[PDB]
Design a protein around this ligand. Structure first.
Ligand SMILES: CCCCCCCCCCCCC/C=C\[C@H](O)[C@H](N)CO
Ligand SMILES: *C(=O)CCCCCCCCCCCCC
Ligand SMILES: *C(=O)CCCCCCCCCCCCC
Ligand SMILES: *C(=O)CCCCCCCCCCCCC
Lengths: 60, 235, 268, 5, 283, 235, 60, 235, 60, 5, 5
């Protein structure tokens, strides 16, 4: 049941990996994976009904 | 039992650690998520939203609605600044409380390009050209259009497109700047000038406000998480 | 070479300038790295750089100094020593950021009857020690940056005792390389020796070296040039010989970012 | 057994 | 592909020579060191060399924790003219001399930093009394975060700063930190200023220390005893050990030859005579 | 839990240990390296660079520039030494402060071949032959050319190649020597003599200096890391 | 995710190996491998523009 | 962290344990072995080498060279013993200090066959037959040839082969004997007698010495390591 | 990287084995295997130039 | 799973 | 992985 993932290596001395085994039945007991996703800011930065083309007039 | 040897760090509590621990409510029936609108995945998403700058922190205008209003008028052309600002997004008092400034005060280091957008709020009948400037650090901070023109700038023509954006490109010696006032990682000078003058016809207000907004570009990032000075709890 | 090519006879041409030498001791490329422009994968400021090319990457000759039996040594900092040199200096003061490599050519001829040996050292981050034992790190910008005239070494440390009006200058002791380390070890820095019987010049090609891809040339010197008499000047039986030393330096692969109005520094 | 990420 | 623990080159056997090849003659003016080996100037036998340079790799040379500071705290009643003592230390390797001298063989470096904390306590007053086992909080406050003013103020909440709560008498505390520099490498030497003095500005306004870059380079460690005070006074000390792991270094330098005198390269009068008397023709 | 039995060494802190430990700044955005010139991979690389020897540590010459200068003159031939030095690279006062000497003072043991190079700094018109000697230990240290010639040596002819190198071959009983003065691991004697004499024409300086350099060969190594005596911190 | 490497054995009583598993996501938390490289000293010992042949005159 | 439960034995230090522990000198360059002659792999190899017995521990002969010499003479035949010895190789005072005896005093238990070899050191002209005896325990210890003959024995004829060996075969109730004087694990009786008599011609010494040696056979072993009583350190 | 060897079983209640993993890079940190060899005593017990045949005269 | 060096 | 003795 071991999960093997890669580290993003900062300062250096191949891919270096690390291992993780969950010891408990409840997912709430798990550590945080930090393997997170990013999304585009559009729902906050461009919430307009008509798609904005930046080279065009915003008002036409 | 399995032979083990306890290493340094044993039994400490690091508040930044990331370990497993026993669950106090085993087999709890968790309520499922629903698709609530407005989910955020990264704090830099918030930094990319334009928020309004409190430019005029005079003793009588600060901590009032007036601090957000930069007054212009139709006076004869001058080469003197409408406003002057230091590019210290976490520490200059005009930038530190913007949403960008606030998020930067939870981090030690920032990097990337920024952008300033100005909104003209005079009447449709009012016209004008302004010069918006960014001077990278190391020379005398611009106090006259003559110097400001020599740096990065946008000449803004007022008209139907109400607003104009100047991008402050990432131009730095270091790979990240500090989120405090620091000469070694100083960012330079933002300023605004009259290019021609504001002109109005008769029967029109001769003075008006512009509002300014700051936000981060898609190449902007922060690091080294830290506590902010922007909130406290005495007693 | 059977066509006559020699280790001792060189010609260097950069921009509208050429140096010839007939008594070289080969030439050095510091750390084996030739100067280069900043690569996209290492780039940091995003604005289009200026690259003045031949207008700045050419040989500039500084003021000639004089070597005598009493000389303890001389030092210069780069880019400081070139701050007033033609369009290189202009580009430097007009931009927040700048990077540059250099060809350093030290010149000193004498005769088959003279003797003496100059150690010529190029030191990355050549931090020198101050004149004070009341305040450390106190040398002023003006005294740290002599421009083309450079500074000198001394055989004696002497602490500034004026507390009212401190001199705020360096006091670089020669056997301690002006920085608290022994001169005999300065050979771990890129160097050549002008030993008058052997050669009449030193040539050091210096890459841009820094912990950053680009930086403030006005605030920071990347390289220091230290010239010290390892064996003192001597001639026939004259008690007071003199021979000149001339420094000619050329910037190489220099590029600049962050254009604004010109910097006008307080240099005095 | 093992999972690889 | 040549590793640090590989054996060095074998000595090859060499016999008598009489030729125009002149290895022994050279010219140090060129700036080069003559690459000779024994078989160039004497007759040698064949030797299969087993020695290696494994212990002098940059990693191995630095692979040791060094003390960089001693912080003092106490657990006393705060009273109107004197408060309970907590400690604040500006992170640096320049308060002590040994690790400083080793790092300064080089101009620049990159490394991950391992900090280990040894904590010792004692009673200071005569009385009998007692104290119960102390817990210590070592809080990192990075440049810009609120530095604590009192042992018990709001900053010790640490919602974002990393803190270690260490229990007295347990194993010495330890954490690692990545390469956190704002440059591509740490500069052991910076020949410059953090400010340009402008002519149009007062001298005071353009002034800055020689060789100093960011005034608060790396922030501070703030340490306190979390326990409330006992009737009896207990003083503690936190010794901080720094080890540079995963290290790279650039541009070699002559080592420090006279006593350190401040965070810069300055030296003190009366300390400038490292070398001792020895006659030229005396073994 | 998994049955474990704590072994000796448990909870100690060995300053030379090599264990993992938790990161206080998780997910920190590290600045990438750039290709800075002059990277070093092993301290012996520095030991292979020639550095200059402070040969003349007389009471008036020590701790001055003069200590690096060995004075020769055109006097009649003598069999008496120009200089005498013990091959104790970490402890002899003339060698202990060279870059090689300094690195050796962070280690307990050294092994391998060394080389001494001398630079003639007289005028082009000056000529001369010198004898540079290495006597392995165990006999009377050479005070006359007669004895020095019987050991390892190079007869140096002064001319256009300004410099000359004598290699001190690794000749030892033990596999490594101690980096202190120690009779059991003594290295022997370095010395320099006039082979003929320095000769100059008229109108020429009759005295001049030679400078000497020491560096390690490619077969040189050190071990058992230790603190140096070459720096301290009183109070 | 285990990394198996060999020891260089000094005093003796095949190849003896040792095992290493990284327990953490950040490479900064890892121990030092001590598997380091060596390089030639040339950039410091022979920084001259024209390659030095040791049997030849250094000055020609 | 991984759930663990500390078992008994935790944190103890057993001097006989066999665990791993951190290295204080990481990456140390070890000196290789060379093929030194005389390598030993097992202490019983030393027990198989013959060493000489201090048979005559009389008040005046003990702790002198004389203790190793057993005097014979050409006197008329007798059935009386030349020497009598208990087979208690670690505790009988004549055997306990031999190399075999010494190694046995670092162990609690011994087992296997032994052998005694005698060397005749009289002149070539001297002749004689002797009886060397081993009586397994449990009866009256032999004081006359009559009894000694009934046990394990060798009749030694003196001649060109200077020496003779009697093997004391492993004959024991228990599988191992104790290395102290113990009746339950007693080994029995070694003795030597005149079979005929020593005869010499005229002009020849009438008295001479024999020397005796003991060593282990290839079936000999020891176990349960222990400290010896044969060395101490008062204060 | 686990090494599996057999125990020599003394008192009994197949081959019983035990497992060993080296946790450190330096062989000096390892436990002792106790898997040792024996040799013949001859270099000490029979160091004679001519091979001894025990049934024959040692002196001929 | 395993890596071998 | 595993070695067997
Ligand atoms: C809970 C405790 C966390 C402790 C975190 C400490 C983080 C800050 C590390 C700073 C790194 C310092 C490295 C050494 C000094 C510099 O290299 C030199 N002045 C050169 O720039
Ligand atoms: C998947 O996990 C199969 C491999 C098992 C590897 C060794 C597990 C180490 C100890 C796990 C204890 C589990 C905690 C309840
Ligand atoms: C690769 O790792 C697969 C094999 C797993 C072997 C057993 C792992 C032992 C316990 C690992 C704990 C990991 C720490 C978060
Ligand atoms: C070979 O070792 C591959 C199998 C790995 C088995 C589990 C290892 C248990 C934990 C090892 C820690 C290593 C110590 C640095």
């Amino acid at each position: 049941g071991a999960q093997v993932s890669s580290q993003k290596v900062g300062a250096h001395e191949s891919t270096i990996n690390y291992t993780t085994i969950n010891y408990y039945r409840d997912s709430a007991s798990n550590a945080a994976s930090k393997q997170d996703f990013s999304q585009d800011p559009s729902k906050f930065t461009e919430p307009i009904k008509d798609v904005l083309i930046k080279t065009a007039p915003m008002l036409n | 039992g399995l032979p083990v040897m306890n290493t340094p760090g044993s039994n400490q509590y690091l508040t930044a650690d990331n370990f497993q621990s026993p669950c106090a409510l085993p087999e709890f029936d968790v309520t499922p998520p629903i698709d609530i609108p407005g989910e955020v995945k990264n704090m830099m998403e918030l930094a990319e939203i334009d928020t309004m700058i409190p430019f005029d922190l005079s003793a009588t205008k600060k901590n009032t609605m007036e601090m957000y209003r930069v007054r212009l008028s139709d006076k004869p052309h001058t080469d003197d600044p409408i406003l002057c600002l230091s590019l210290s997004p976490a520490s200059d008092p005009r930038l530190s409380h913007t949403m960008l400034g606030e998020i930067l005060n939870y981090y030690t280091h920032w990097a990337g390009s920024l952008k300033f957008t100005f909104l003209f709020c005079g009447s449709m009948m009012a016209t004008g050209k302004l010069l918006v400037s960014y001077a990278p650090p190391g020379a005398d901070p611009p106090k006259k259009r003559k110097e400001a023109m020599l740096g990065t700038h946008v000449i803004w023509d007022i008209g139907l497109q109400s607003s104009c954006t100047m991008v402050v490109p990432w131009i730095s010696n270091t790979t990240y700047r500090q989120t405090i006032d620091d000469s070694f990682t100083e960012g330079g000078y933002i300023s605004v000038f009259y290019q021609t003058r504001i002109v109005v016809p008769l029967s029109t207000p001769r003075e008006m406000d512009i509002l300014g907004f700051v936000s981060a570009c898609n190449d902007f990032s922060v690091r080294l998480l830290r506590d902010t000075t922007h909130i406290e709890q005495k007693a | 070479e059977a066509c006559g090519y020699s280790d001792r006879v060189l010609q260097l041409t950069l921009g509208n300038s050429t140096i010839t030498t007939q008594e070289a001791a080969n030439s050095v490329v510091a750390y084996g790295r030739w100067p280069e422009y900043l690569r996209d994968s290492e780039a940091n400021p995003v604005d289009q750089p200026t690259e003045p090319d031949v207008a700045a990457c050419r040989f500039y000759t500084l003021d000639t100094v004089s070597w005598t039996k009493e000389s303890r040594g001389w030092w210069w900092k780069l880019p400081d020593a070139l701050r007033d040199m033609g369009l290189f200096g202009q580009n430097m003061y007009y931009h927040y950021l700048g990077r540059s490599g250099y060809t350093v050519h030290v010149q000193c001829n004498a005769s088959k009857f003279h003797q003496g040996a100059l150690g010529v050292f190029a030191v990355p981050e050549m931090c020198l020690a101050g004149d004070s034992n009341t305040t450390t790190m106190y040398t002023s910008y003006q005294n740290a940056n002599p421009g083309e005239k450079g500074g000198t070494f001394t055989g004696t440390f002497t602490p500034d005792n004026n507390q009212t009006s401190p001199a705020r200058r360096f006091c670089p002791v020669d056997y301690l390389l002006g920085n608290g380390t022994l001169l005999g070890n300065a050979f771990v820095f890129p160097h050549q020796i002008i030993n008058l019987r052997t050669n009449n010049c030193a040539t050091l090609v210096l890459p841009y070296v820094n912990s950053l891809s680009i930086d403030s040339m006005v605030k920071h010197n990347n390289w220091g040039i230290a010239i010290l008499p390892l064996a003192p000047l001597n001639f026939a039986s004259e008690s007071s010989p003199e021979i000149p030393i001339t420094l000619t330096i050329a910037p190489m692969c220099c590029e600049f970012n962050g254009l604004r109005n010109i910097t006008l520094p307080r240099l005095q | 057994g093992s999972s690889s990420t | 592909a040549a590793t640090s623990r590989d054996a060095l080159p074998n000595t090859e056997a060499s016999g008598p020579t009489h030729s125009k090849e002149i290895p022994a003659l050279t010219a140090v003016e060129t700036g080069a060191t003559n690459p000779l080996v024994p078989s160039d100037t004497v007759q040698t036998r064949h030797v299969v060399q087993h020695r290696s340079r494994s212990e002098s790799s940059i990693e191995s040379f630095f692979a040791r924790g060094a003390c960089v500071t001693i912080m003092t705290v106490d657990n006393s009643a705060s009273t109107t003219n004197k408060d309970k003592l907590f400690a604040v230390w500006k992170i640096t390797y320049k308060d002590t001399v040994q690790l400083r001298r080793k790092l300064e063989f080089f101009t620049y470096s990159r490394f991950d930093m391992e900090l280990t904390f040894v904590v010792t306590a004692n009673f200071t007053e005569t009385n009998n009394g007692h104290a119960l086992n102390q817990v210590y909080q070592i809080m990192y406050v990075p440049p810009g975060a609120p530095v604590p003013e009192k042992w018990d103020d709001y900053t010790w909440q640490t919602s974002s700063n990393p803190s270690i709560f260490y229990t007295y008498g347990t194993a010495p505390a330890r954490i690692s930190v990545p390469y956190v520099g704002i440059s591509n490498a740490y500069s052991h030497f910076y020949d410059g200023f953090s400010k340009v003095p402008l002519k149009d500005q007062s001298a005071a306004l353009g002034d800055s220390l020689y060789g100093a870059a960011s005034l608060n380079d790396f922030g501070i460690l703030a340490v306190r005893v979390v326990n409330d005070h006992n009737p009896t006074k207990v003083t503690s000390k936190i010794r901080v050990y720094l080890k540079p792991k995963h290290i790279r270094v650039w541009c070699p330098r002559p080592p420090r030859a006279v006593a350190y005198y401040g965070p810069g390269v300055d030296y003190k009068d009366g300390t400038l005579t490292p070398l001792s008397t020895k006659d030229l023709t005396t073994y």
